[PDB]
Amino acid sequence: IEDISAMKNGFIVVPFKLPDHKALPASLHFMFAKRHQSSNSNESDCLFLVNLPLLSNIEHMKKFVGQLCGKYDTVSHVEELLYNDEFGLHEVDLSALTSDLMSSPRNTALLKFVDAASINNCWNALKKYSNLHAKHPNELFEWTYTTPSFTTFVNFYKPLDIDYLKEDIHTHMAIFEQREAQAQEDVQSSIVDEDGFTLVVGKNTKSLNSIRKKILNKNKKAKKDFYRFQVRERKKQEINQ
Amino acid sequence: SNIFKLQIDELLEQVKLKQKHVLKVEKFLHKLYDILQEIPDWEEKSLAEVDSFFKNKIVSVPFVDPKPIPQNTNYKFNYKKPDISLIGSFALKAGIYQPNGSSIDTLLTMPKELFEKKDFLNFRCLHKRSVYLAYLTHHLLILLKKDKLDSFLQLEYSYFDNDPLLPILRISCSKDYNFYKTRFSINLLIGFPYKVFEPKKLLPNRNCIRILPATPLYNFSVLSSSTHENYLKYLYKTKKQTESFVEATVLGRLWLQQRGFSSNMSHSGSLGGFGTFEFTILMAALLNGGGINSNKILLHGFSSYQLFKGVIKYLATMDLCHDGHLQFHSNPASKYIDEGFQTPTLFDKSTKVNILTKMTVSSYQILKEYAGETLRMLNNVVQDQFSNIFLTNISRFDNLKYDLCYDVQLPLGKYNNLETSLAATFGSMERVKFITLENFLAHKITNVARYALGDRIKYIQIEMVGQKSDFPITKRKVYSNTGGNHFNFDFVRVKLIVNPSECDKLVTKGPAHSETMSTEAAVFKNFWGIKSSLRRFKDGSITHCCVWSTSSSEPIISSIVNFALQKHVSKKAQISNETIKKFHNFLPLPNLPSSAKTSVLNLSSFFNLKKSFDDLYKIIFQMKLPLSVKSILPVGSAFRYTSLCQPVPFAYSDPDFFQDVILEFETSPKWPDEITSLEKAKTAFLLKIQEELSANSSTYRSFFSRDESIPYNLEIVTLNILTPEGYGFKFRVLTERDEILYLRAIANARNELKPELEATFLKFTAKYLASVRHTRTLENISHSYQFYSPVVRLFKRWLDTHLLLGHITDELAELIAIKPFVDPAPYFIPGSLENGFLKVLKFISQWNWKDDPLILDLVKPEERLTLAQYKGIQMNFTNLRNSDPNGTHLQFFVASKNDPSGILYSSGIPLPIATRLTALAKVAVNLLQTHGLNQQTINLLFTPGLKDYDFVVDLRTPIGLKSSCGILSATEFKNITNDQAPSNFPENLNDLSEKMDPTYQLVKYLNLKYKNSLILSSRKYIGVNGGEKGDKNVITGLIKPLFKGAHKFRVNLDCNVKPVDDENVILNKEAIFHEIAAFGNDMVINFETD
Amino acid sequence: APESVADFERLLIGNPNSSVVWMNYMAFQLQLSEIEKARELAERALKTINFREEAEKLNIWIAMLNLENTFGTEETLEEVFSRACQYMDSYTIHTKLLGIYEISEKFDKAAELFKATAKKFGGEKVSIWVSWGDFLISHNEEQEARTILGNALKALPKRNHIEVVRKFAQLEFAKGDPERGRSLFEGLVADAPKRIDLWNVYVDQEVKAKDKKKVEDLFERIITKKITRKQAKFFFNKWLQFEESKTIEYVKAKATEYVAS
Secondary structure, three states: OOOOOOOOOOOOOOOOOOOOOOOOOOOEEOOOOOOOOOOOOOOOOOOOOOOOOOOOOOOHHHHHHHHHHHHHHHOOOOOEOOOOOOOOOOOEEEEHHOOOOOOOOEEEEEOOOOHHHHHHHHHHHHHHHHHHHHHHHHHHOOOOOOHHHHHHHOOOOOOOOOHHHHHHHHHHHHHHHHHHHHHHHHHHHHOOOOOOOOOOOOOOOOOOOHHHHHHHOOOOOOOOOOHHHHHHHHHHHHHOO | OOOHHHHHHHHHHHHHHHHHHHHHHHHHHHHHHHHHHOOOOOOOOHHHHHHHHHHHOOOOOOOOOOOOOOOOOOOOOOOOEEEEEEHHHHOOOOOOOOOOOOOOOEEEOOOOOOOOOOOOOOHHHHHHHHHHHHHHHHHHHHHHHOOOOOOOOOEEEEEOOOOOOOEEEEEEOOOOOOOOOOOOOOOEEEEEOOOOOOOOOOOOOOOOOOOOOHHHHHHHHHHHHOOOOHHHHHEEEEEOOOOOOHHHHHHHHHHHOOOOOOOOOOOOOOOOOOOOOHHHHHHHHHOEEOOOOOOHHHHHOOOOOHHHHHHHHHHHOOOOOOOOOEOOOOOOEEEEEEOOOOOOOEOOOOEEEEEEOOHHHHHHHHEEEEHHHHHHHHHHHHOOOOHOOOOOHHHHHHHHHHEEEEEEEEEOOHHHHHHHHOOOOOOOHHHHHOOHOOOOOOHHHHHHHHHEEEEEEEEEEEEEEEOOEOOOOOOOOOOOOOOOOOOOEEEEEEEEEOOOOHOOOOOEEEEOOOOOHHHHHHHHHHHHOOOOOEOOOOOOOOOEEOOOOOOOOOEEEEEEEHHHHHHOOOOOEEEOOHHHHHHHOOOOOOOOOOOOOOOOOOOOHHHHHHHHHHHHHHHHOOOOOOOEEEEEEEEHHHHHOOOOOOOOOOOOOOOOOOOOEEEOOOOOOOOOOOHHHHHHHHHHHHHHHHHHHHHHHHOOEEEEEOOOOOOOOEEEEEEEEEEEEEEEEEEEEEEEOHHHHHHHHHHOOOOOOOOHHHHHHHHHHHHHHHHHHHHHHHHHHHOOOOOOHHHHHHHHHHHHHHOOOOOOOOOHHHHHHHHHHHHHOOOOOOHHHHHHHHHHHHHHOOOOOOOOOOEOOOOOOOOOOOOEEEEEEEHHHHHHHHOOOOOOOOOEEOOOOOOOOOOOOOOOOOOOHHHHOOOOOOHHHHHHHHHHOOOOHHHHHOOOOOOOOOOOEEEOOOOOOOOOOHHHHOOOOOOOHOOOOOOOOOOOOOHHHHHOOOHHHHHHHHHHHHOOEEEEEEOOOHHOOOOOOOOOEEEEEEEOOOHHHHHHOOOOOOOOEEEEOOOEOOOOHHHHHHHHHHHHHOOEEEEEEE | OOHHHHHHHHHHHHOOHHHHHHHHHHHHHHHHHOOHHHHHHHHHHHHHOOOOOHHHHHHHHHHHHHHHOOOOOOHHHHHHHHHHHHHOOOHHHHHHHHHHHOOOOOOHHHHHHHHHHHHHHEEEEEHHHHHHHHHHHOOOOOOOOHHHHHHHHHHHHHHHHHHHHHHHHHHHHOOOHHHHHHHHHHHHHHHHOOHHHHHHHHHHHHHHOOOOHHHHHHHHHHOOOOOOOHHHHHHHHHHHHHHHHHHHHHHHHHHHHHHHH
């Protein structure tokens, strides 16, 4: 049974082809689809898609949605694969977790468009794609399994090119020391409040975030004698004992 | 000082309630000695006619050797009703419910009227004893057959403690009057009269047999036939004195049966001879003194625990064999006399007997060692090891309580065929001091093994297997074809435990050269024949010695024992020892000059890369940075003698070819702040160091490689260098800042994101910080535990053939293999590779997780871990796995001095992998105790155990890589692997991806992609496990128990999806296995589902 | 069926991420009334749950606070409430706390926490206020939950000041007072006519308050404005098929007449 092709919560079953293994004669990689929203600049007119192909990157999604565009007259404005986490190495950001700035869903690649009419045209096209794959398994709409997976994951013993990472960390240090000296100068230049309140600061401290986090992390001589109520309590002591 | 006696009372409640099986059988032996009471006399009738009288009967007479021919048997062949006594085991209350069977002691000493003053010569009184036995068993068999209780009994002629001089009458019961649900073998024994002759014949310097080589064995045997009644008088009077004896000796017999020391005999070639009443005798002898001034060793003021401790202290600090032995007389102080009789000795002057002459010199030697070893593990106040000292029967296996084994098969043919089938002695003077053929070959073979090895082994034990003290009613003797002879042994166990520092030393040294060739050089040249000669040395000494051509597969201990066997005791017998060579080609043999002739205890490859590393060290210190080097420290597996290739130059194909070296600069407070910026500054320093390296010394070459063995830091590279001596080193910069950066990242992270960043910091600590003291400690200790690098290398190849290295880490495998070394109790340290490896697997099959931590201190023999740190380690273990209920995600707990947390290396491994390891260990020890060691046994121990658990892929890269990894493939020619050996560096360094394998890290990537659906494994030592061509690799996968069937579709299922219903989904297993092969499209060849 | 402790831990080993299994193991001790042992097992569970599943960590914290509300007392309720607000989202802890406090029938903490939490997360939302207003009308505090409009308008910014009178008019038409609810709705129809949702849902809430004469006046009084074709089809069908569910002849006439003008 393949005619079951759409789930309860708007999920659009998207099957594709698989290539030829030398011993395998089938070939059902399954994806989901939605159309979700939020007013921020990374979730408006967007789509989930679940159960990703390995190294789903920008270029074969480019060619696949171009194939659908030239196939069944859908319009599409693709730009980038938003929040592509397939391996699981970019959840917690250590650099933002302990930095001054450059601060701030499992196998669900998100993808948004420019035109909501374009993403609705691809939505209707994809629902018809799901049911045409359900009807026939041989006149498929297709993302063929094109492989830049090889181009990024059979060559990983490569020496990273020396001049490239030279200029890369050259630019990284050249912006890091700039924003660092800017932050420290902003710290110990002069801080008056809205009213008159000069802020106490260290001799060689570096960040308002630093003094903020240390003020977050920083969240006797009585006498048993000498008073006449204490001679009252000690006469009570010296008559009870 | 509190809970060991609670353990003692646990042993008491384990051993007790003997009444249900002492009362009924004391009633049954009461009926039995009533039957012996109504057995009447049988007067003097001649020997030559009782031959014919017993001829056509079923009772053919047993005999001591040889059969008494009537030319001199003019003895009084009487029979009288003897004296009954119910003594010993069931009268002094030392009965363990063993499923093998406790013994019994019923005494029938001979009456006064059937001997003479000079009856004690030429063992025809023992012939009298044997025919006495023959009539008693004939009379008893017809009486019990007319009393019709033969339906469950069977009588048998045995030997009293494996001695042919003393046969006994043992009764074994089988399936109202039957006793078969527990201990067997109720035996009766006759003895000699109490006091007959003045003690000159009782002295161990007697021989009245014909032409004086004395007979101390025989005048001890007849004296032990007679005078073991004063000793139980002594036992009973100390029993009436005080009470701790019964529990002290059930403890003693318990420990001695765990050590394999029963009181049969070690003169006949078996481990034993020492036993429970000997233990009683030495406790009560140390009662009234023990010192040289008879200072009281043992008071009953302290109970059995300190009685036992004082006993083991006296036996370990007071020699008996060669210098000093105990003296005591039962009729009465006890002291310590000064010399030794070259045999286990203690003198009892009221008997003139030598009670410890039932076992031999090597058996006493190994028992004094066991005294010292259990004393060492008993006197310590650190931990509690009562189950380590008692409750593990070490006697179960041969190669576990011993270190290696030889089996001499001697096909001598016949007793007459001796003179051309074996080169040993054949004399009156040897048959007068040795009972039989196995006895003289046993004493000769232990003396020639002792003289052949000397300072080459710790201890030798000889044990003839196929021996049995069992011969039937109808038969006169053990009438048994014992595989090429008719003597009571099949073949000779030669079990060796070795001083491991002189196994593969290829020259043993006799005395030097005087002109007058004295007797020591004489007996050296006689014992060594044509082979040994006198040589010069670099010192210039002229000394007697012999060359031992060391091979890899063969330890030279087997060659020297092969010559010491085939030169002296036989000239055509053969030696069986195939286990050592059976795994030594399972070791990988590197492409080194004369590497077959190199030992396995040679470390010249590791020293070669250490020399290359040191010249690199000098050329990286003699240059100028903007921030100087504080220290570099190698941390590599080769720098701690662990890597599976014994590291040959240019050997790229091993994935741990690149050793890793941490390097740290001085504490400059100028550093970048955030973590990506600081690791990029470390890359900047590595850019500068390789820039000046290629500037000045271009004979080294280098490149950069990203590392992702720490999670979530995207910009951490390592500097890899290729050294023109032919090696490859990773360099990782450490700073003083990364530790506090990770700690404050931990502090300011979101509170539901804490333990993952804690896991990142734990991986950092394991990779950078504690790894240095790890490799320092065990590299320092490997030169004291010399078999460590071979046992870890064979363990790691076993673990990759059984496919676990994709989850477990190599330091954890290293810690599991150091565990039997730094704590080998109750055993020895392993002087051989097999003993090490099966000690590892026996321990980890024993080992649990729920109530079992693993504390070890990697210390030198004889800085340790004290009580406070021990309790802190156990307490954080305790709260750790009461927070963790059963080991849901934390399985092992390996805690050292260098990591009292213990969770550093055990983290990350899945529960199926850990349970698979423990199950494989239990399967291996099951196979060991069932099938025995064999070539197919070892091949089954290195079978893949592929199990067809859901997934098999078969992978072959387009080239073979064993000539490139440098392990030679046992070829007939070395130029065949030399012209394919990669003794050149590749110029464009990108080609190492196709000169190596991608399988381990691609299985890593796929595992972290499918972390909650299926766990994957790949053979990461490619043709080390993959046959001979060097190409076969597998990919396997165990599916989770969650995905047994279709599940309700969600967004957090996060798996490979197939809606088989509108609500239910399952894997597209063919599509994802196809995508695995699609990623490995050039790597994959074959695939099998299920 | 789950009976023994090894069976329970076998369920949790073979199933790590189903709150069905997790609250089965919790509800076993809840039903055996060894609920302090369930408290220490809960301290096991919150730190042995996988941390990726936000909904399931909501499940385990909701279940722990369900324990502390069903049998606990306020001095530990505030403790686990503070720990829940620290670990996970304070606002959803507040909403589940308010629902569960009125389920366990404790006004003496419920009204005070309604006040404090509508103060807290009511300057960026509306539901923490309107749950309080609906609760007060359900427990007979009509004018008290009508006086909440000034509190809502000074708590929130300008952006959903339409939405506060929207929602309080929702609950006033639910079970408050209809003509006083229209006296709230007059600010909606005076502020914004060009939001076409408010008119339609206001006459639909007029239908569900069912004052039929003013239904027959309100539908007949919308139509004189600038009505586009989708809005015409909406209002037209919601009158005509409702009359399907004295006037029907005139709106059958207006089915054709207002096609022209």
